[PDB]
Paper text:
Rhodotorula dairenensis β-fructofuranosidase is a highly glycosylated enzyme with broad substrate specificity that catalyzes the synthesis of 6-kestose and a mixture of the three series of fructooligosaccharides (FOS), fructosylating a variety of carbohydrates and other molecules as alditols. The β-propeller catalytic domain contains residues 185 to 487 and is constituted by five blades (I-V), each involving four antiparallel β-strands (ABCD) with a “W” topology. The β-sandwich domain, extending from residue 495 to 673, is composed of twelve β-sheets ordered in two six-stranded clusters of antiparallel β-strands.
A single homogeneous band with a molecular weight of 85–90 kDa was observed in the SDS gel after a combined α1-2,3,6 mannosidase/Endo H enzymatic treatment, which allowed crystal structure determination at 2.05 Å resolution. RdINV was indexed in the C2221 space group, with two molecules in the asymmetric unit and 37.4% solvent content. They are associated in a “butterfly” shape to form a tight homodimer related by a well-defined two-fold symmetry axis, similar to that previously described in the SoFfase homolog. At least six O-glycosylation sites (Thr146, Ser147, Ser151, Ser153, Thr161, Thr163) located at the beginning of the chain and 13 N-glycosylation sites (Asn197, Asn240, Asn255, Asn263, Asn341, Asn350, Asn405, Asn475, Asn505, Asn514, Asn525, Asn535, Asn546) distributed over the two domains were clearly defined at the electron density map within each monomer. A PEG and a glycerol molecule were captured in the catalytic site of chain A at subsites −1 and +1, whereas glycerol and Bis-Tris were trapped in chain B. A remarkable feature is the presence of a di-sulfur bridge linking Cys143 to Cys555 that connects the prominent Pro551-Pro566 loop to the visible portion of the N-terminus and possibly helps in keeping the structural integrity of the Ser140-Asp168 region that has been observed in the crystal. Moreover, the Bis-Tris molecule shows one of its hydroxyl groups very close to the fructose and, thus, is in a proper position to act as an acceptor substrate in a putative transfructosylating reaction.
Author numbering:
A (entry chain B): 142 to 673
B (entry chain A): 140 to 673
The structure:
């Protein structure tokens, strides 16, 4: 059969009061509902919050949650748990505002195993949440603590723990550094990340400012100050300041940027004055790193949307708005010429990988992969290309036509008669080894595939990144309404929402003009739903 | 007389010579349905970066440009030359600078007047022009000098060229200017993401002064640096220095883009006021901006190449005898905008010489004005929309309806299009702005894929661009010129250059406002523009 395109009113109707102590029940069957990404059971989700791995290995994801509407507001912290970052268990709402005229904005969570806070005299797995409380006139930082492993939180009796008398002061990311707690918090409309320190998470002292770096956009948000291992040597690492900006991103709306540098417990110093954008498309925002991971592990997740159209995407009839990105493992590397680069790769996908749909070593060919049998409507693919040494040593031996095309094509079996009726691909990827646009990689969601997408004036159709080195590896995940691509071992990555009128039913992978002796290896797998 | 511009031209108008003409102006047919009528485009062939931009002592503006006279793609670079007194009415001139042989190219550079004969080239004239440009060879990029004594038409190479080599193949686009007591060159160490600053007493001996490295967006290369002094918009007695750098490829929208840095320059060092990156244009088709040398005091005048390296060599205009047009000429200022602070202002240079008949004037709020310009033979229009919100709405924006918006749509001609079936009526370009609601301050500029078979199929021809204001939109000015739309927001605070290649020519425009607060004043003015070629 075919995934429903709209759900019964009982699956999409939202409560008039926020459920306390109860898990919100969700129908995850909609034709747009991602099957291996997190999305809330009902309602509207945005930024990931309080991300941490507990001592039993369970990942806790919290998130900005409107349980009452399909648009942003009434923010609570939703909560889901996973042991593998793919199979999620919805949990009751973790943090509630004190009244209907306040909202629980973004923040972070840490384990306090040594009871620095004083909240945990008889436990070693105390969790402290540090979050922004939004009121009509102020944004302040507050603490709440959990003794049950991060399910139920109690507000700190002397909240707030930090106010500067500002209405633009939010998204505290807290972490342990040697002998004290560090908070990175956004003085959002001043384009400043403020660094504060604390011995106990409740009394905070100003250390330093990081101001007017990289792209300003209209606000700094969701700062993450994290230590990231080197891809080619995970014994080595550097600090990275990751800043989300919204609005005012170059593609429009929201985007993440980063700065490699040094951190010494009080001051972050960037290695240079350059601006670096994390993702070359527009649906990757508010990346948050999981606290309490071990040495050599950098784990993050982002909200896979854009503030310019997140509240207008056509999924509310399927009981949700917004999904998280694939969970990510991060590295730092140097790429040819450009130097510093934030590597993003999908966190181990093995737990959701299903049957092989195609395995091919054919070069200069077109492989058609039908996945109308894959009930998840989600696929993974990996394409490796190894050029002959002669082509690496002399690039003038590569034909101008040497290229790769990947197209995701609409289902004939589950086609909508109401949409475009187009045979337009839902999504395309094009790369040129040489010619006039040498190294250029285009990722597109053709307007002709989506009535909604064509009409939305911010739903940009085409994205590109230009490689210096030849493309040697490409990995992708398509999950009903999302495509993520990872180029050259995660050197470059892009997160793109797609809302085709007809569900994707097949994909074509074409290579052509590749030099004599070029090795091509393609693998495609159906993914297994984590919700069904 | 024709009723519709030709979409394809006779082979005589498009066929390119097999040898580069010397001493002769290349003849051009400027009638194609995509040929801009108030922007500069080469008579035939392929153009890119503006070069050697300067005003001579007679008040004549000289535009040079990267020129392939032999193909409709980049290569065989010479300097083309056109002159104007007003930066709208252009006169094509013979090719100004030629490579020494068939295996070298004249890459980008700048030109200056040397009235005091610092160079030694001009013992008997105060009208000497010196061009400083990159010579590209298979293995090297070096800086060379050439001088003109006839007012910038014919150049002679300096006998001891090159004037500057560092043994690099990525070393180009020198912009030279006078600072107090010496010449300054800003030149790109392109693949090192460094602008090198050299000084010279005479334009032929250059000394290294300082580096400006790894600032703003890196892209894949730094190109065409401009280090210029720009007056304050609200106070012409004040100014600051600006480092303007083009990057290609690797721009965030894909391909090529311009960025800038406000700062201080003292003759040897440029120091940015902060570590922020600032993008000049919020669309895709504005690159290699160059400032005119030797303007009057307090006039900052620039022009850019209105294209993108990802599709400039593939745009469907070669059948109309050209590839590439320059942007409108721009008057530049610096200002502070709400919250963001420093901002490069770009406004169209005085358009009065090309303004034709008024097509529409409206004071109506919450209405739709339909403007037919099928009778405007230039197929080019200017519009200005002013909006004055009531003070109550300025002081408290929660008083503005979520519906408060402006929509501008450019619609295909019924008079010059006989096309039928799906997509036939798609707008060629749209502009949408919201005062409030979920995307408050958001301005979208789009070129619908459905309007252009070529644009839909090109994988780099991005359909939608946006910029988000902090302040309400109070002014919007635009020029549509056959195949180009440029928009200027809030007195040139924000600007965008966007190419459009609709299957049918544009014949009409709709301007709609809705949901505007009670007592909002709106003024809309639209004029046909007069062709500068015809
Ligand atoms: C993947 O899709 C792209 C289109 O997005 C294909 O690229 C295009 O390929 C053709 C064939 O090489 C190009 O045509 C050629 O034009 C040049 C002149 O520019 C000519 O010298 C060649 O003989 C040929 O006729 C076309 O320009 C090009 N389009 C773009 C936008 O670059 C690509 O071939 C596809 N690759 C595969 C493996 O399917
Ligand atoms: C001012 O900036 C210029 C341009 O960045 C500097 O010259 C450049 O210096 C670097 C470092 O010495 C050179 O990079 C290196 O190149 C060699 C050759 O391929 C390579 O073996 C090394 O691994 C390294 O990447 C670069 O070639 C060179 N570029 C140019 C155009 O000369 C210059 O040193 C700076 N001067 C000062 C005083 O800061
Ligand atoms: C650190 O950064 C903050 C934020 O930019 C600075 O505080 C701001 O200071 C300016 C100038 O007085 C005020 O106009 C803003 O309203 C303040 N913003 C906030 C969030 O308070 C602070 O002065 C900086 N401190 C240091 C030591 O540089
Ligand atoms: C201009 O066009 C836009 C659509 O692009 C109109 O926007 C919609 O406005 C209503 C409120 O009036 C919202 O509820 C919709 O969500 C908006 N659409 C989008 C895509 O955001 C806008 O009203 C139009 N304005 C005028 C003056 O015609
Ligand atoms: C709601 O709580 C916030 C602090 O949490 C307080 O500032 C505000 O006054 C409260 N509002 C009402 C209506 O009680
Ligand atoms: C809790 O810790 C206190 C010290 O603060 C100690 O006296 C007591 O034995 C502990 N109680 C339990 C149940 O472990
Ligand atoms: C981890 O498991 C232990 C033993 O089963 C249990 O006591 C503890 O509560 C668990 N911790 C968390 C954070 O769930
Ligand atoms: C945290 O440390 C500060 C500074 O010593 C102290 O004043 C404050 O009381 C501490 N808070 C708690 C809850 O221990
Ligand atoms: C951190 O480094 C800064 C210089 O960037 C220095 O001023 C400060 O004292 C250092 N702090 C510590 C804790 O070493
Ligand atoms: C990248 O190269 C720089 C030298 O330019 C070096 O200092 C840094 O450690 C390198 N980083 C990685 C991740 O290899
Ligand atoms: C691919 O096709 C190119 C272009 O026709 C040809 O030169 C080459 O032999 C082919 N290479 C492979 C690996 O099949
Ligand atoms: C591509 O290469 C990577 C690393 O060498 C490997 O893990 C992967 O299985 C390869 N994929 C294919 C389709 O051969
Ligand atoms: C062309 O002129 C350049 C610059 O003088 C020189 O380097 C190059 O060798 C010349 N090429 C030939 C083929 O003469
Ligand atoms: C330019 O000035 C330098 C330094 O005084 C001098 O050596 C050089 O000969 C001059 N060049 C000419 C062409 O006069
Ligand atoms: C220009 O300023 C720099 C510092 O920014 C200084 O080192 C240099 O001496 C100055 N040069 C002149 C000519 O004043
Ligand atoms: C912008 O504001 C800064 C700080 O007040 C000031 O130094 C600068 O001169 C201003 N620039 C303009 C163009 O008004
Ligand atoms: C425009 O219409 C809105 C209702 O949509 C109304 O509130 C407003 O008063 C009108 N404004 C003007 C200037 O007529
Ligand atoms: C808008 O006002 C400006 C001056 O503020 C004026 O130059 C322009 O002609 C006006 N345009 C309209 C639409 O009234
Ligand atoms: C969801 O859209 C589908 C199109 O496949 C319809 O069949 C259904 O009625 C609902 O509108
Ligand atoms: C979504 O809307 C469709 C209308 O076709 C129904 O099929 C479904 O029950 C739900 O209301
Ligand atoms: C509300 O009712 C619908 C059917 O109309 C069910 O799908 C759902 O489980 C709930 O009972
Ligand atoms: C649940 O909510 C959805 C989205 O608003 C509706 O389409 C449905 O009928 C029910 O109200
Ligand atoms: C669930 O119930 C608790 C009980 O006090 C409320 O505080 C909460 O807002 C929600 O309604
Ligand atoms: C969570 O909400 C459910 C709704 O039925 C209750 O059963 C529970 O007591 C808690 O309020
Ligand atoms: C230019 O394009 C137009 C499209 O209608 C044709 O009429 C003409 O013959 C030429 O192809
Ligand atoms: C433009 O179209 C004409 C035919 O109308 C041709 O002569 C020319 O080669 C180009 O295709
Ligand atoms: C002149 O050039 C144009 C573009 O290639 C052709 O359409 C025409 O036939 C002639 O070759």
């Amino acid at each position: 059969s075919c995934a429903p395109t709209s759900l019964p009113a009982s699956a999409t109707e939202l409560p008039t009061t926020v459920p306390t102590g109860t898990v919100i029940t969700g129908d995850y069957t909609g034709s747009y509902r991602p099957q291996v990404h997190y999305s809330p059971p009902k309602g509207f989700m945005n930024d990931p919050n309080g991300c941490h791995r507990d001592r039993n290995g369970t990942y806790h994801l919290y998130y900005q949650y409107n349980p009452l509407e399909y648009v942003a507001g009434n923010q609570h912290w939703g909560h889901a748990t996973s042991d593998d970052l793919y199979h999620w268990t919805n949990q009751p709402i973790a943090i509630f505002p004190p009244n209907s005229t306040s909202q629980v904005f973004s923040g972070s969570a840490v384990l306090d195993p040594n009871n620095t806070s004083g909240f945990f005299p008889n436990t070693t797995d105390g969790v402290v949440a540090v979050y922004t409380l939004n009121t009509p006139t102020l944004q302040v930082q507050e603490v709440a603590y959990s003794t049950d492993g991060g399910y139920n939180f109690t507000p700190y009796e002397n909240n707030p723990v930090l106010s500067v008398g500002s209405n633009q002061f939010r998204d505290p990311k807290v972490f342990w550094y040697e002998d004290h707690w560090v908070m990175a918090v956004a003085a959002a409309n001043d384009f400043t990340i403020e660094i504060y320190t604390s011995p106990n998470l409740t009394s905070w002292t100003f250390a330093s400012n990081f101001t007017h770096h990289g792209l300003l956009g209209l606000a700094y948000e969701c700062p993450n100050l994290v230590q990231v291992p080197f891809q080619d040597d995970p014994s080595k690492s550097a600090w990275l300041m990751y800043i989300s900006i919204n609005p005012g991103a170059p593609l429009g709306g929201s985007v993440g940027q980063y700065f490699p540098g040094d951190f010494n417990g009080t001051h972050f110093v960037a290695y240079d004055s350059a601006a670096r954008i994390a993702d070359f498309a527009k649906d990757n925002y508010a990346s948050q790193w999981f606290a309490d991971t071990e040495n050599g592990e950098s784990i993050s997740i982002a909200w896979a949307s854009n503030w310019q159209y997140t509240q207008q995407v056509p999924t509310s009839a399927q009981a949700f708005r917004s999904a998280m990105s694939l969970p990510r493992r991060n590295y730092l590397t140097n790429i040819t010429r450009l130097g510093w680069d934030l590597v993003s790769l999908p966190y181990d996908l093995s737990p959701v990988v299903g049957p092989s749909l195609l395995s091919s070593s054919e070069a200069n060919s077109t492989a058609d992969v039908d996945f109308t049998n894959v009930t998840s409507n989600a696929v993974w693919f990996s394409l490796n290309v190894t050029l002959p040494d002669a082509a690496i040593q002399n690039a003038s031996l590569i034909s101008a036509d040497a290229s790769i095309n990947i197209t995701f094509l609409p289902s004939t079996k589950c086609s909508s008669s109401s949409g475009s009726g187009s045979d337009s691909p839902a999504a395309t990827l094009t790369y040129f080894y040489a010619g006039l646009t040498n190294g250029a990689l285009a990722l597109t969601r053709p307007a002709a595939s989506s009535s909604w997408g064509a009409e939305n004036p911010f739903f940009t159709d085409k994205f590109s990144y230009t490689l210096v080195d030849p493309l040697t590896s490409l990995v992708g995940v398509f999950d009903r309404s999302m495509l993520e691509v990872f180029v050259n071992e995660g050197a470059h990555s892009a997160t793109m929402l797609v809302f085709p009128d007809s569900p994707v039913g097949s994909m074509k992978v074409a290579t052509g003009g590749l030099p004599e002796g070029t090795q091509v290896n393609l693998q495609v797998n159906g993914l297994e739903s984590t919700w069904q």
